[PDB]
Design a protein around this ligand. Sequence first.
Ligand SMILES: [Mg+2]
Ligand SMILES: [Mg+2]
Ligand SMILES: [Mg+2]
Ligand SMILES: [Mg+2]
Ligand SMILES: [Mg+2]
Ligand SMILES: [Mg+2]
Ligand SMILES: [Mg+2]
Ligand SMILES: [Mg+2]
Ligand SMILES: [Mg+2]
Ligand SMILES: [Mg+2]
Ligand SMILES: [Mg+2]
Ligand SMILES: [Mg+2]
Ligand SMILES: [Mg+2]
Ligand SMILES: [Mg+2]
Ligand SMILES: [Mg+2]
Ligand SMILES: [Mg+2]
Ligand SMILES: [Mg+2]
Ligand SMILES: [Mg+2]
Ligand SMILES: [Mg+2]
Ligand SMILES: [Mg+2]
Ligand SMILES: [Mg+2]
Ligand SMILES: [Mg+2]
Ligand SMILES: [Mg+2]
Ligand SMILES: [Mg+2]
Ligand SMILES: [Mg+2]
Ligand SMILES: [Mg+2]
Ligand SMILES: [Mg+2]
Ligand SMILES: [Mg+2]
Ligand SMILES: [Mg+2]
Ligand SMILES: [Mg+2]
Ligand SMILES: [Mg+2]
Ligand SMILES: [Mg+2]
Ligand SMILES: [Mg+2]
Ligand SMILES: [Mg+2]
Ligand SMILES: [Mg+2]
Ligand SMILES: [Mg+2]
Ligand SMILES: [Mg+2]
Ligand SMILES: [Mg+2]
Ligand SMILES: [Mg+2]
Ligand SMILES: [Mg+2]
Ligand SMILES: [Mg+2]
Ligand SMILES: [Mg+2]
Ligand SMILES: [Mg+2]
Ligand SMILES: [Mg+2]
Ligand SMILES: [Mg+2]
Ligand SMILES: [Mg+2]
Ligand SMILES: [Mg+2]
Ligand SMILES: [Mg+2]
Ligand SMILES: [Mg+2]
Ligand SMILES: [Mg+2]
Ligand SMILES: [Mg+2]
Ligand SMILES: [Mg+2]
Ligand SMILES: [Mg+2]
Ligand SMILES: [Mg+2]
Ligand SMILES: [Mg+2]
Ligand SMILES: [Mg+2]
Ligand SMILES: [Mg+2]
Ligand SMILES: [Mg+2]
Ligand SMILES: [Mg+2]
Ligand SMILES: [Mg+2]
Ligand SMILES: [Mg+2]
Ligand SMILES: [Mg+2]
Ligand SMILES: [Mg+2]
Ligand SMILES: [Mg+2]
Ligand SMILES: [Mg+2]
Ligand SMILES: [Mg+2]
Ligand SMILES: [Mg+2]
Lengths: 114, 48, 25
Amino acid sequence: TGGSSKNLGGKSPGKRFGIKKMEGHYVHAGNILATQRHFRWHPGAHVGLGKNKCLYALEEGVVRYTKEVYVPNPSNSEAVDLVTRLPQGAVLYKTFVHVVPAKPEGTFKLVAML
Amino acid sequence: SKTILVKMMSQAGTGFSFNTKRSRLREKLTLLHYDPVVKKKVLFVEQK
Amino acid sequence: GSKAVTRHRRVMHFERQKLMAVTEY
RNA sequence: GACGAGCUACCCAUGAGCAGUUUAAAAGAACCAACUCAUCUAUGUGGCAAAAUAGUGAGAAGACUUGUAGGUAGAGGUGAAAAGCCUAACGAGCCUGGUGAUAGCUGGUUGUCCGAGAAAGAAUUUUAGUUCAACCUUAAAAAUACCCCAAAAACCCUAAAUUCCAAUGUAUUUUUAAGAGAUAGUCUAAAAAGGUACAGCUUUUUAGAAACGGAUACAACCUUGACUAGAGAGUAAAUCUUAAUACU
RNA sequence: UUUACCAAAAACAUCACCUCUAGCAUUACUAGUAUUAGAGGCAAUGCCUGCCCAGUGACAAGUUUAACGGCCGCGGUACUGACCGUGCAAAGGUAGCAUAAUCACUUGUUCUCCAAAUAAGGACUUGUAUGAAUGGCCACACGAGGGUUUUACUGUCUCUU
RNA sequence: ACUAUUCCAAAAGUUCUUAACAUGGACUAGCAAUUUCGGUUGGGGUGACCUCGGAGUACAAAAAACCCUCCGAGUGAUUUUAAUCUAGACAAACCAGUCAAAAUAAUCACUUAUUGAUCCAAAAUUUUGAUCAACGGAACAAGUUACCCUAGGGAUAACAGCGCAAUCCUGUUCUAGAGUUCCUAUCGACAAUAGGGUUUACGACCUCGAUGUUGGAUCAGGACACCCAAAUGGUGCAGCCGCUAUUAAAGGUUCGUUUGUUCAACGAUUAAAGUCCUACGUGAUCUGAG
Ligand SMILES: [Mg+2]
Ligand SMILES: [Mg+2]
Ligand SMILES: [Mg+2]
Ligand SMILES: [Mg+2]
Ligand SMILES: [Mg+2]
Ligand SMILES: [Mg+2]
Ligand SMILES: [Mg+2]
Ligand SMILES: [Mg+2]
Ligand SMILES: [Mg+2]
Ligand SMILES: [Mg+2]
Ligand SMILES: [Mg+2]
Ligand SMILES: [Mg+2]
Ligand SMILES: [Mg+2]
Ligand SMILES: [Mg+2]
Ligand SMILES: [Mg+2]
Ligand SMILES: [Mg+2]
Ligand SMILES: [Mg+2]
Ligand SMILES: [Mg+2]
Ligand SMILES: [Mg+2]
Ligand SMILES: [Mg+2]
Ligand SMILES: [Mg+2]
Ligand SMILES: [Mg+2]
Ligand SMILES: [Mg+2]
Ligand SMILES: [Mg+2]
Ligand SMILES: [Mg+2]
Ligand SMILES: [Mg+2]
Ligand SMILES: [Mg+2]
Ligand SMILES: [Mg+2]
Ligand SMILES: [Mg+2]
Ligand SMILES: [Mg+2]
Ligand SMILES: [Mg+2]
Ligand SMILES: [Mg+2]
Ligand SMILES: [Mg+2]
Ligand SMILES: [Mg+2]
Ligand SMILES: [Mg+2]
Ligand SMILES: [Mg+2]
Ligand SMILES: [Mg+2]
Ligand SMILES: [Mg+2]
Ligand SMILES: [Mg+2]
Ligand SMILES: [Mg+2]
Ligand SMILES: [Mg+2]
Ligand SMILES: [Mg+2]
Ligand SMILES: [Mg+2]
Ligand SMILES: [Mg+2]
Ligand SMILES: [Mg+2]
Ligand SMILES: [Mg+2]
Ligand SMILES: [Mg+2]
Ligand SMILES: [Mg+2]
Ligand SMILES: [Mg+2]
Ligand SMILES: [Mg+2]
Ligand SMILES: [Mg+2]
Ligand SMILES: [Mg+2]
Ligand SMILES: [Mg+2]
Ligand SMILES: [Mg+2]
Ligand SMILES: [Mg+2]
Ligand SMILES: [Mg+2]
Ligand SMILES: [Mg+2]
Ligand SMILES: [Mg+2]
Ligand SMILES: [Mg+2]
Ligand SMILES: [Mg+2]
Ligand SMILES: [Mg+2]
Ligand SMILES: [Mg+2]
Ligand SMILES: [Mg+2]
Ligand SMILES: [Mg+2]
Ligand SMILES: [Mg+2]
Ligand SMILES: [Mg+2]
Ligand SMILES: [Mg+2]
């Protein structure tokens, strides 16, 4: 009996998208925080956005997650319109990641007393 | 249609770029690129 | 192995049958 | 690389047989012996015999049978092609070398007693195999390891639950140096697929198990984890029960 | 004539008929010389042997099938189709024979044969997968070949002694 | 290689030739050599697929199978030519993949997929080369074997057993309907619920250091879902035949023509010429037509 199943190429590995660090994790500058294919979490304070929508930590610190108000860039039109048609009482919210800096910025050392 | 690999030549020195071009030739290839030796912005000309 | 829903009435694991006989009305 | 045509295939020499009967006849004619074959049946099957015996059959002056002696030799010979025959196994002889050929494939692998102990993620002319990872064993160095309350992880609907962490209960875990085996699993509960809401069915994910005690019997279900002695004790799972009536 | 030791046949050979290839001397052929000698095909005899050089060959572009091999549609019309149209081919399967030692349907149809026959023989017959030297068709004479009937005979068997 | 062919050199001579030997390099054939004939697979063959990405399966960190269910890619379209060098990271068997601060001076097409490792080749100053698509890629190899051979496997088929019961097979439950009227004498659509384990399948669980496989012969053991004989209910049963249903397994259940045939047709009869199971009973009893 002809057993042809017409479907092809279901097979891909998973991309291991997801959250790499968790709230209250210590982080060094450069660590990737989470990696996603669509924006699930947006970059907050001290979190840089990679061209593939990676989130990495800019400072040395503690990673925090947050629900905050979303005010799209006036250059990006779709989001501008989505913001436009809302009923007059409602604001948009999203989830952000943050780094909270640990090390102080610097120190004043006494080099020489002349 | 096809894709042609073309080798660009800089005005000055031995700097050589390699890039791809279109069969239909939408935009003929002439570039402003970066030369390492003089550390400059250059005019690169399409060659073979 | 038999599916979660079946028509042949599906014999229960013994520990669960005891569980049944204990909780009767 | 030797040795084999004393069997058999075909030739070359040199010899030898063929009675009777019928027909003008030695005519690949009749009939029927010797002689040659091997049809059909039954015996026989470690036989009388590594192919026979008894009956019964075909041919029987011819492409006939048969004796002695030569010849052709294996990448070959010979063949009225059956891929036949070439010394009791010929789709390619036998022997001695190469030769302890080579077998991811079977089959075997020898004293005692103790420690610790494994179930399949990748690639692969790969799925009967290897080589990496993970687990693990033997040494070493160290510091935290499991457990883990808030807090936290998405946008329409979305259960059991995960991930991540102090306290706390414990002693485990990570690195370094050496190593292998293993990588052909079964069922039971749960979530799903495929099939017939079928399999002692197949395909993944999460758990369990493989008692000398129970379920008589029993691999996977249930009770228990472990040593050596006692003609002591307490317990565990478990022994199998349940039923059903009138209309005036 | 053959599978010594599971197959003697329808297989092979063979008279006959045809294709090729050869113009010549010391060891074969051959002490031969084209009416001869080598490679082969197909199997006497009788009647026959249709059309096809486009492919692959082979020969010395062209030529060849008694070389390897091939030898049709689709619809319209007097239930049928002599006719008709158009397409493709190198040609379009003819003479025969036919349910067959011929894919299947399939135990084709019908007659004869028996009390009864999926057997046997005779016919019809598109065999859509027969068919003419990979030979087609009839016929003597011959088979330890296969099948069918009859006579006769009997322990095959009724059914054993 | 050889046997032949054709040619060019060589060799001899002529001013272009080849008598027989005979070497170098070609050519064109015959005879002939050497080596292979990928893999997944609900046995193998035929069919289909082999890398890469989106969904589902896999519901909320990751991962996650099938010859699972569905859509895609082996590139286009531009302009703005999208640079060096180095912290820390994701991912990961490995190989490949990914982000990226500081320091110097690409976009749209669901956007995610648009791609091939070494070696070896060509190139210039530096780099380009594959339906290597069997897509971790052998520099280049197909058919057959019933003439077959070895090593293995019940890790895997054919026979038989077992599992399951789709199909098949016996019951009942429901009355629309047939039955002129009348559901249930005899039946009965659409449907419900139990069973049986012979069929064709489906699984691959025992056997491949052999469980010898169809039909007959002989001899039968068993079931009862009775074909006869024996008791009975109902009838659209007057009687004769009948048609249905209940109870009953001690005993029976023919001889022929054609087929290897069980089946089936057909002749002739019988009280009847049952349906089955037993390794489709029975080959260390027989027969091999198949
Ligand atoms: Mg997927
Ligand atoms: Mg995958
Ligand atoms: Mg290219
Ligand atoms: Mg001799
Ligand atoms: Mg001799
Ligand atoms: Mg005589
Ligand atoms: Mg004679
Ligand atoms: Mg006798
Ligand atoms: Mg005689
Ligand atoms: Mg005679
Ligand atoms: Mg002979
Ligand atoms: Mg032959
Ligand atoms: Mg043969
Ligand atoms: Mg011998
Ligand atoms: Mg060895
Ligand atoms: Mg390979
Ligand atoms: Mg292997
Ligand atoms: Mg912790
Ligand atoms: Mg297995
Ligand atoms: Mg393995
Ligand atoms: Mg069971
Ligand atoms: Mg497990
Ligand atoms: Mg016991
Ligand atoms: Mg103890
Ligand atoms: Mg003989
Ligand atoms: Mg013989
Ligand atoms: Mg014989
Ligand atoms: Mg003949
Ligand atoms: Mg002539
Ligand atoms: Mg003739
Ligand atoms: Mg002709
Ligand atoms: Mg005709
Ligand atoms: Mg026929
Ligand atoms: Mg024909
Ligand atoms: Mg011919
Ligand atoms: Mg023919
Ligand atoms: Mg004659
Ligand atoms: Mg004869
Ligand atoms: Mg005869
Ligand atoms: Mg060699
Ligand atoms: Mg293959
Ligand atoms: Mg295979
Ligand atoms: Mg298959
Ligand atoms: Mg199977
Ligand atoms: Mg195929
Ligand atoms: Mg910068
Ligand atoms: Mg290349
Ligand atoms: Mg491969
Ligand atoms: Mg591969
Ligand atoms: Mg890969
Ligand atoms: Mg044969
Ligand atoms: Mg063998
Ligand atoms: Mg098995
Ligand atoms: Mg059997
Ligand atoms: Mg079976
Ligand atoms: Mg058995
Ligand atoms: Mg059942
Ligand atoms: Mg089934
Ligand atoms: Mg299995
Ligand atoms: Mg076996
Ligand atoms: Mg044995
Ligand atoms: Mg009996
Ligand atoms: Mg009864
Ligand atoms: Mg009886
Ligand atoms: Mg039997
Ligand atoms: Mg039998
Ligand atoms: Mg027996």
